[PDB]
């Protein structure tokens, strides 16, 4: 059955968009990540590097 959507309808019947994102568990090589850091570089000083 078709929805009835009008600008004068109530908030309960107002149209709303829902996006559901589901990520699978770790069972395969990873392909989706995020940016880590962009820290600057220093020289001639005792530092801990990663």
């Amino acid at each position: 059955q078709s929805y009835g959507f009008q600008p004068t309808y109530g908030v309960g019947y107002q149209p709303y968009r829902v996006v559901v994102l589901s990520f699978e568990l770790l069972h395969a090589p990873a392909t989706v990540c995020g940016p880590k850091k962009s820290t600057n570089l220093v020289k001639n000083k005792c530092v801990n590097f990663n």
Binding site: R17, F23, V32
Partner: protein, 49 residues
Amino acid sequence: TRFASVYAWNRKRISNCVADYSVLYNSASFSTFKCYGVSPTKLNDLCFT
């Protein structure tokens, strides 16, 4: 703005790319944030398939 109907929803597979989660989390245009287990800091510190 063009989304499919609820009975005929469109499934999009996203992989083999870097995901940016800060843009979604720093926007007030969204109201629902019901996420289970994950927190906005956590999911940026690991990777999935």
